[PDB]
Amino acid sequence: TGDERFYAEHLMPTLQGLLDPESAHRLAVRFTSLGLLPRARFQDSDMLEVRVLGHKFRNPVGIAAGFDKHGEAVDGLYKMGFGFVEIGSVTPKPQEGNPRPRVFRLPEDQAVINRYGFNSHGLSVVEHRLRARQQKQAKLTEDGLPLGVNLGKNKTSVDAAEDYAEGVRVLGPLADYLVVNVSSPNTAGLRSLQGKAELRRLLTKVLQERDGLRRVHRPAVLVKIAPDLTSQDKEDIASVVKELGIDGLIVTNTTVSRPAGLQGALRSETGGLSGKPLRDLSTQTIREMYALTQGRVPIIGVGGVSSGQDALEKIRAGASLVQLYTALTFWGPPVVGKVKRELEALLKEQGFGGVTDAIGADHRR
Numbered sequence: 001t002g003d004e005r006f007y008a009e010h011l012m013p014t015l016q017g018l019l020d021p022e023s024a025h026r027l028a029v030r031f032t033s034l035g036l037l038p039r040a041r042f043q044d045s046d047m048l049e050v051r052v053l054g055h056k057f058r059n060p061v062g063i064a065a066g067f068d069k070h071g072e073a074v075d076g077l078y079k080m081g082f083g084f085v086e087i088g089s090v091t092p093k094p095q096e097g098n099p100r101p102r103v104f105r106l107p108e109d110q111a112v113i114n115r116y117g118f119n120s121h122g123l124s125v126v127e128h129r130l131r132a133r134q135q136k137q138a139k140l141t142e143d144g145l146p147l148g149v150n151l152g153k154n155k156t157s158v159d160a161a162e163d164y165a166e167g168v169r170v171l172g173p174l175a176d177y178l179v180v181n182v183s184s185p186n187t188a189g190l191r192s193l194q195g196k197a198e199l200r201r202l203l204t205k206v207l208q209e210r211d212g213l214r215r216v217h218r219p220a221v222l223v224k225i226a227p228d229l230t231s232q233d234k235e236d237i238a239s240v241v242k243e244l245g246i247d248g249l250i251v252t253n254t255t256v257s258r259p260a261g262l263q264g265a266l267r268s269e270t271g272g273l274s275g276k277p278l279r280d281l282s283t284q285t286i287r288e289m290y291a292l293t294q295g296r297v298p299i300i301g302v303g304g305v306s307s308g309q310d311a312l313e314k315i316r317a318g319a320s321l322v323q324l325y326t327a328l329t330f331w332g333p334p335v336v337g338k339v340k341r342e343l344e345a346l347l348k349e350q351g352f353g354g355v356t357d358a359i360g361a362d363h364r365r
């Protein structure tokens with residue numbers, strides 16, 4: 001399509017020439033929150049529908065956490081064509097995050113590196129903002145357009161588990177699913193919450209707070225993990241996830257690795273790397289986690305998705321849903337309908353009646 005072509009060849013290069021990546025992101029969140037976008041050409045077919053996590057998803061393509069950190073553009077994101085929206089990460093108290101510059105474009109790699117550091121308006125602000133549209137969301141969700149909320153922890157916090165428990169209490173009642181983000185590379189000590197004993201203690205507390213919410217306000221709880229785990233780490237996560245009945249996994253966050261071959265001048269900036277160089281590392285983490293949980297723990301696959309093929313590879317590896325974030329940054333809004341359209345064509349070509357039939361198909365070969 002000409003829209004996709006116009007953005008890819010003209011508008012996006014012009015926008016990257018004019019604005020640093022943080023400004024462009026802020027501007028994009030502002031435009032999107034105002035609805036200043038086309039509106040979806042692409043009409044979702046029934047093949048794209050997925051039922052998982054106690055919900056219907058009209059399509060399996062979501063916006064990853066980090067784009068709409070503070071819950072300001074949710075409605076414009078559904079308008080862009082995403083089948084579900086995840087906001088956050090949200091910390092209990094407001095905090096500024098790291099000094100700028102803290103986001104970097106690696107155009108030659110179709111990659112970004114970021115070290116935002118959980119810049120967040122905080123739970124109260126985000127709570128009031130979601131409350132103002134709570135019933136509009138309840139109808140969106142009933143219509144197949146769910147909302148997730150991704151929870152983080154304050155930089156100076158002296159008890160991580162209590163930060164996450166507060167998140168559960170405050171935003172849990174407004175969310176279809178929560179994410180316990182234990183995988184940011186930009187918060188000191190955070191990723192060590194993924195180890196066995198810490199993780200079990202942490203998630204036991206999270207699930208207990210979730211279980212004490214009223215039934216209609218009780219979300220699914222997912223754990224978002226890194227692409228950089230050891231085999232031991234992964235085995236331990238899978239075991240805990242099964243022992244506690246965690247509802248799902250988000251696989252993966254950004255990488256602290258720098259794969260060989262990066263060309264961008266900014267490749268040695270500190271931060272998490274996203275985009276194309278993360279793609280297969282993420283797909284393989286998905287593959288492993290699905291096998292370790294015997295295909296019984298729903299997985300939302302994320303990292304380097306910019307095409308229908310990218311998405312279908314994660315689905316066949318075991319993802320029930322996918323997300324993207326960095327591709328939007330390079331190709332703009334038209335990438336959303338593009339991924340959905342190609343995914344549907346590939347599903348037909350490969351003989352799948354729908355997305356659901358493809359889920360984990362590589363493990364049954």
Ligand SMILES: Cc1cc2nc3c(=O)[nH]c(=O)nc-3n(C[C@H](O)[C@H](O)[C@H](O)COP(=O)(O)O)c2cc1C
Binds near residue numbers: 114116274275324
């Ligand atoms: C600028 C930026 C900010 C991000 N912030 C968050 C965040 O606050 N919480 C989170 O769980 N993941 C965050 N992510 C990670 C994305 O949700 C996603 O896991 C990762 O970028 C891989 O997907 P992608 O290759 O499609 O961008 C962020 C990513 C980027 C690029």
Ligand SMILES: O=C1N=C(Nc2ccc(F)cc2C(=O)O)S/C1=C\c1cccc2ccccc12
Binds near residue numbers: 021024028067333
């Ligand atoms: O040019 C753009 N750059 C974007 N983001 C970024 C660009 C570079 C970077 F290092 C990081 C980001 C980021 O979001 O961290 S988003 C965008 C364009 C649009 C994206 C979404 C909605 C829009 C709506 C209207 C106009 C442009 C956009």
Ligand SMILES: O=C(O)c1cc(=O)[nH]c(=O)[nH]1
Binds near residue numbers: 114186272
């Ligand atoms: O710095 C952040 O806020 C952030 C970046 C990132 O890549 N992942 C994450 O979970 N948080």
